[PDB]
Each structure stands twice: as C-alpha cells, then as structure tokens.
Design a protein around this ligand. Sequence first.
Ligand SMILES: NC(=[NH2+])NCCC[C@H](N)C(=O)O
Length: 241
Amino acid sequence: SSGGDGGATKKKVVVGTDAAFAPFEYMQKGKIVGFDVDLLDAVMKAAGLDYELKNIGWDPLFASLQSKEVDMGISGITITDERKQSYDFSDPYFEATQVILVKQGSPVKNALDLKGKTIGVQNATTGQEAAEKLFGKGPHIKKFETTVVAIMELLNGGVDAVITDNAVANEYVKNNPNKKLQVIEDPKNFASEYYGMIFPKNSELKAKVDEALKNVINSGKYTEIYKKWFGKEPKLDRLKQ
Ligand SMILES: NC(=[NH2+])NCCC[C@H](N)C(=O)O
C-alpha cells in the first residue's frame, strides 16, 4: 500500500484540456465551458466515473498523458496515425477540417497562395502539420502555445494567415465581426479530421468511455449538446466512418 491510501477513497479521473479553443473549451467567468466540457460531463456520468477537469494547456496535456499524471484528455483533439503510436483514442465524436483564417483584405484564395507568407499555428497541432505539408517545415510557420495567441498575431499583422480548425475559426468570426476576419476553406488541400478523447497507451478507461459515448449518442444527449453549441442538427453518420 506504500505510496497510496490502500483504497480509503476512490480517486477521481484526472482529465486535462487546453481551454483556449472556443466553442470546444474556453474560460468564462473563471469556469471551463464549451462543447467538449458538456460532452465530457455527460460521458463520464454515463460511465459512472467521478472526474476533475483541469485547464493544463496544450503541450503540458500531451506531456502529462505520456507520464500518466493525467488519465484522459478532451481538447478538440484530432485522431492521427502518429498520435496513435503514443496514445489511445476513443471512438470519434466530431468531424472537422483545417481552414485558413485571414483578414478581410487578404489576397489569399487557397492554400497555395500562402507561398512566401508567414503562417501562424498552435504548436504540435494538425494545423501546424497541414502548414508544413504545403511548402515544407521552416521558420515561415510561427508556432504558439495557444490558438488564441495565433489569432492575436493575425490581428496585429505578426502573421499573414492562421491555419486552425473550422469550427474554431467560424466561431471566432461569428463572435468578432468588428475584427473583419474571414475563413478561406480549401477542401482539395485539407483532409477530413475526426476528434477523439485521448488516453495514455493501454488505458483501462478507453472501453468505459467508448460505451458511455455510445450511451450519450443513443439517448439523444449528444445531439442536445450539439444543438446548444452549433444551432443545427448533427449528422450522426459522420461518427461511423
Ligand atoms: N484545445 C485545443 N487547443 N485544441 C487544438 C486542436 C487542434 C487540432 N484538432 C489537433 O488535434 O491538433
């Protein structure tokens, strides 16, 4: 029993996030809110698992999954083959794509127009990878610890464009008409992406979360949550690809 409490209290599942990614997770009057926050609460409750959500940030979240200090993550995280080498994922719960966020005056009409330009991304994201895919890795791509800061460098002209997830870019534009930004989609260039909850490799929580996610989808709770954040019916068939 050394190092533990010999079972005196069942410990809570430690869930990490980077709450700087509206509408999925963000801070509002000192609380973490968003689509992921709601979906997590429904999932863990269906699983019967007491939990704590921590706003630990993006790069720390991955480091902490590796060490198993954090048991689980939800953070608008794309399921990728490279990530699967290090972590496990739940079944998918959302579909997304990368998009190009620019100022309304921008001449950018597609990804190839970014040649010779500076691109802001959040570090170690699928947006960074998509940016690197275009013309290769290099210092022309500026990497920030939050998507928030990437967008701030767009606003002040530090970068020419940001590559980030479509619902985040769309939500930012909707909430900030005064900033006169626009979203440029390039479906021939960018791939379909699916979000999953993330776990350390070999996690006992995965199977429980997959079952609870199905429970939440099947009961109609998923679509209530989706309607709350996105104002339209989900196409649930996107979750069976
Ligand atoms: N909460 C966040 N900062 N999420 C960033 C997610 C970006 C992208 N979906 C990825 O998995 O790389």
